[PDB]
Design an enzyme around this catalytic site. Structure first.
Site, mmCIF file in Angstrom:
data_model
loop_
_atom_site.group_PDB
_atom_site.id
_atom_site.type_symbol
_atom_site.label_atom_id
_atom_site.label_comp_id
_atom_site.label_asym_id
_atom_site.label_seq_id
_atom_site.Cartn_x
_atom_site.Cartn_y
_atom_site.Cartn_z
ATOM 1 N N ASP A 170 0.889 -1.185 0.000
ATOM 2 C CA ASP A 170 0.000 0.000 0.000
ATOM 3 C C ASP A 170 0.916 1.221 0.000
ATOM 4 O O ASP A 170 1.441 1.547 1.085
ATOM 5 C CB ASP A 170 -0.931 -0.003 1.211
ATOM 6 C CG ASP A 170 -1.881 1.177 1.276
ATOM 7 O OD1 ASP A 170 -1.718 2.122 0.463
ATOM 8 O OD2 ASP A 170 -2.763 1.144 2.152
ATOM 9 N N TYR A 214 -9.086 13.583 -8.101
ATOM 10 C CA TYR A 214 -8.262 13.081 -9.231
ATOM 11 C C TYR A 214 -7.538 14.259 -9.891
ATOM 12 O O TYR A 214 -6.311 14.201 -10.037
ATOM 13 C CB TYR A 214 -9.123 12.349 -10.246
ATOM 14 C CG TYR A 214 -8.332 11.552 -11.240
ATOM 15 C CD1 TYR A 214 -7.524 10.502 -10.832
ATOM 16 C CD2 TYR A 214 -8.379 11.857 -12.590
ATOM 17 C CE1 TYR A 214 -6.796 9.755 -11.746
ATOM 18 C CE2 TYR A 214 -7.634 11.142 -13.511
ATOM 19 C CZ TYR A 214 -6.845 10.079 -13.090
ATOM 20 O OH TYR A 214 -6.157 9.343 -14.009
ATOM 21 N N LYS A 242 -3.539 14.611 -9.714
ATOM 22 C CA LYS A 242 -2.852 14.444 -11.016
ATOM 23 C C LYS A 242 -2.117 15.743 -11.353
ATOM 24 O O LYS A 242 -1.026 15.651 -11.931
ATOM 25 C CB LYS A 242 -3.850 13.976 -12.075
ATOM 26 C CG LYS A 242 -4.420 12.589 -11.792
ATOM 27 C CD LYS A 242 -3.431 11.466 -11.991
ATOM 28 C CE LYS A 242 -3.401 10.506 -10.828
ATOM 29 N NZ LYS A 242 -2.637 9.283 -11.159
HETATM 30 N N1 LIG Z 1 -6.478 3.874 -17.978
HETATM 31 C C1 LIG Z 1 -6.614 5.122 -18.404
HETATM 32 O O1 LIG Z 1 -7.216 5.402 -19.434
HETATM 33 C C2 LIG Z 1 -5.988 6.238 -17.598
HETATM 34 C C3 LIG Z 1 -6.267 7.570 -17.925
HETATM 35 C C4 LIG Z 1 -5.550 8.578 -17.333
HETATM 36 C C5 LIG Z 1 -4.709 8.286 -16.287
HETATM 37 N N2 LIG Z 1 -4.481 7.010 -15.905
HETATM 38 C C6 LIG Z 1 -3.516 6.737 -14.821
HETATM 39 O O2 LIG Z 1 -2.849 5.530 -15.125
HETATM 40 C C7 LIG Z 1 -2.515 4.837 -13.901
HETATM 41 C C8 LIG Z 1 -2.979 3.403 -13.994
HETATM 42 O O3 LIG Z 1 -4.381 3.362 -14.357
HETATM 43 P P1 LIG Z 1 -5.095 1.942 -14.620
HETATM 44 O O4 LIG Z 1 -6.099 2.079 -15.712
HETATM 45 O O5 LIG Z 1 -4.057 0.868 -14.698
HETATM 46 O O6 LIG Z 1 -5.905 1.731 -13.271
HETATM 47 P P2 LIG Z 1 -6.448 0.362 -12.638
HETATM 48 O O7 LIG Z 1 -6.757 -0.572 -13.754
HETATM 49 O O8 LIG Z 1 -7.523 0.697 -11.663
HETATM 50 O O9 LIG Z 1 -5.148 -0.110 -11.844
HETATM 51 C C9 LIG Z 1 -4.974 0.536 -10.560
HETATM 52 C C10 LIG Z 1 -3.726 0.016 -9.897
HETATM 53 O O10 LIG Z 1 -3.458 0.809 -8.709
HETATM 54 C C11 LIG Z 1 -3.019 -0.075 -7.707
HETATM 55 N N3 LIG Z 1 -3.229 0.533 -6.410
HETATM 56 C C12 LIG Z 1 -4.347 1.211 -5.998
HETATM 57 N N4 LIG Z 1 -4.257 1.651 -4.768
HETATM 58 C C13 LIG Z 1 -2.992 1.262 -4.354
HETATM 59 C C14 LIG Z 1 -2.301 1.448 -3.144
HETATM 60 N N5 LIG Z 1 -2.811 2.104 -2.106
HETATM 61 N N6 LIG Z 1 -1.050 0.939 -3.056
HETATM 62 C C15 LIG Z 1 -0.549 0.294 -4.124
HETATM 63 N N7 LIG Z 1 -1.112 0.038 -5.306
HETATM 64 C C16 LIG Z 1 -2.346 0.567 -5.360
HETATM 65 C C17 LIG Z 1 -3.820 -1.355 -7.913
HETATM 66 O O11 LIG Z 1 -3.155 -2.408 -7.200
HETATM 67 P P3 LIG Z 1 -4.045 -3.669 -6.656
HETATM 68 O O12 LIG Z 1 -4.759 -4.194 -7.899
HETATM 69 O O13 LIG Z 1 -3.019 -4.645 -6.129
HETATM 70 O O14 LIG Z 1 -4.991 -3.203 -5.563
HETATM 71 C C18 LIG Z 1 -3.785 -1.454 -9.438
HETATM 72 O O15 LIG Z 1 -2.634 -2.129 -9.923
HETATM 73 C C19 LIG Z 1 -3.125 5.659 -12.759
HETATM 74 O O16 LIG Z 1 -2.144 6.472 -12.122
HETATM 75 C C20 LIG Z 1 -4.181 6.502 -13.476
HETATM 76 O O17 LIG Z 1 -4.420 7.695 -12.754
HETATM 77 C C21 LIG Z 1 -5.121 5.974 -16.531
#
Ligand SMILES: NC(=O)c1ccc[n+]([C@@H]2O[C@H](COP(=O)([O-])OP(=O)(O)OC[C@H]3O[C@@H](n4cnc5c(N)ncnc54)[C@H](OP(=O)(O)O)[C@@H]3O)[C@@H](O)[C@H]2O)c1
Ligand SMILES: NC(=O)c1ccc[n+]([C@@H]2O[C@H](COP(=O)([O-])OP(=O)(O)OC[C@H]3O[C@@H](n4cnc5c(N)ncnc54)[C@H](OP(=O)(O)O)[C@@H]3O)[C@@H](O)[C@H]2O)c1
Lengths: 256, 255
Positions: B62, B156, B160
């Site tokens: 975490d 967010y 961000k």
């Molecule tokens: N996907 C998009 O289109 C998009 C758009 C703009 C920005 N982003 C940015 O891209 C990044 C990844 O997005 P994503 O789509 O991969 O999101 P996601 O599918 O929800 O993946 C979220 C990840 O965050 C981890 N996490 C959450 N809380 C945590 C904590 N307290 N300690 C450690 N790990 C934690 C989760 O780990 P666990 O599964 O082990 O809980 C998971 O691997 C983020 O920073 C997001 O803001 C994504």
């Protein structure tokens, strides 16, 4: 004029926040100021506002605490009327000088509670009555440290940059209510001394060096900031929203 | 070529982070990924790294808990060597849709602890050895919601945007040790479905309006982001520091 408007300036007890309160007062606003560790200094500013012929209220708020903010705004609403103009001027960790890896987690945590969650608490408290009234001005206080970075100031650069994001989301939620939300991106301010500005917590020869990095080769007067804030707070600024407006005397340009 | 480098991708358990970890491995890095709620998904990612013939390590972190973060980095050092490449990709509150006045303090506080204190804690743990080894790469993950706002996303957009400020300070403190620190400002990403992207937590009507407001009229392939991240992680990106680089198919232009 800001006649018939009510302003809350967080951190109104002294420094720039005090000159914000007096400037809003001079322009016609009835003004609330917060105090945290200086509720007495707050009351003294309220008496300066009263001496200008305006209604004033000093309330005691740690802006990180949602109960104290909510109680404080509800107090303003009873005494003055709902907040029309919010200035999120209260800040923690203004002049830290510590590399990130030597930065204590509890200093970081406090800076984020005051500088971000403080603004979130205060905005949440005032915006329902602004929407109901179809008028609102929220002014967030950022820093060129937030847009350009600052060695040894990880929390300040993070929180001051974070406030620009907060500004743009709140500008979106408030737009159709004539609620504007803008960030002032501050350079450095002088005035009489430490009572007027946190710049004086910086070693004089470091201040002389920062001043030589301003194109105007002088720190801003507190009034030069408050007058921009007062314009944004006016009805005439109704089509300015979600901006980061630099008040920095060219500190952010490529000055020699 | 990232051969002889150790990467830590926070939130490598799935989504874009997984593709980040996999892409850095393909480029020759030994890669540690985190899990929090999904340590088994994170162990699965480490095994995909091993199939590429690299060393891996799932660690249960975490990122808000500095103790959990410090041990995790300690563990990586022993097994893989000191982290040379940090990707602060873990995020909370990615798809809130709640006006500020209706947003709960506890959801706000959690979003801040994960998105800001996470980046802080991880950078705090890895930067002493990056300084010691006179080399380092820190990649913060930001979002156009941070630079342009987003209705119902106060935490967010705040976090961000704050990561760009944090990027610039760490760039200034790291510059003399050949440590770069850069933010990727993401648009929206597709891939296979909810597995590859948290874009899919957004209702399909809203996703089509967002897509049509990209100049390229499509979400990004996760790889199209991971490849930019991989280049910033290379030795060749040594004069790029403290920038906010947009990977978003023109979502930030007047489409
Ligand atoms: N996907 C998009 O289109 C998009 C758009 C703009 C920005 N982003 C940015 O891209 C990044 C990844 O997005 P994503 O789509 O991969 O999101 P996601 O599918 O929800 O993946 C979220 C990840 O965050 C981890 N996490 C959450 N809380 C945590 C904590 N307290 N300690 C450690 N790990 C934690 C989760 O780990 P666990 O599964 O082990 O809980 C998971 O691997 C983020 O920073 C997001 O803001 C994504
Ligand atoms: N001066 C400059 O050159 C400069 C430059 C860039 C940006 N700024 C920004 O300008 C604003 C004012 O700076 P300043 O120089 O006037 O600072 P200051 O002189 O140190 O005043 C700080 C103010 O914040 C209040 N405060 C602190 N923590 C609080 C909390 N948790 N809850 C409520 N109030 C709290 C203090 O009230 P109490 O004393 O009663 O506790 C005080 O009124 C800040 O947002 C700062 O980031 C200043």
């Amino acid at each position: 004029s800001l006649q018939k408007r009510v302003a809350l300036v967080t951190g109104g007890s002294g420094g720039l926040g005090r000159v914000h309160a007096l400037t809003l007062a001079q322009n016609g606003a009835d003004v609330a100021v917060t105090g945290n560790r200086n509720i007495d200094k707050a009351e003294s500013v309220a008496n300066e506002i009263r001496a200008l012929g305006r209604k004033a209220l000093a309330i005691k708020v740690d802006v990180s605490n949602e109960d104290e903010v909510n109680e404080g705004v509800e107090k303003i609403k009873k005494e003055l009327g709902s907040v029309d103009i919010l200035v999120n001027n209260a800040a923690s960790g203004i002049v830290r000088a510590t590399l990130i890896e030597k930065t204590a987690k509890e200093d970081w945590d406090q800076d984020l509670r005051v500088n971000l969650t403080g603004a979130f608490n205060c905005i949440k408290a005032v915006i329902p009555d602004m929407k109901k009234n179809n008028w609102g001005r929220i002014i967030n206080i950022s820093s060129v440290t937030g847009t350009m970075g600052g060695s040894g100031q990880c929390s300040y650069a993070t929180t001051k940059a974070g406030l620009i994001g907060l500004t743009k989301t709140v500008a979106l939620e408030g737009a159709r209510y004539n609620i504007t939300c803008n960030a002032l991106v501050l350079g450095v301010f002088g005035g009489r001394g430490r009572e007027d500005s946190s710049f004086y917590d910086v070693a004089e020869p470091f201040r002389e060096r920062i001043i030589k990095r301003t194109a105007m080769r002088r720190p801003g007067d507190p009034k030069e900031l408050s007058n921009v804030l007062a314009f944004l707070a006016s009805d005439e600024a109704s089509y300015v929203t979600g901006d980061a407006i630099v008040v920095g005397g060219g500190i952010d340009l490529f000055t020699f």
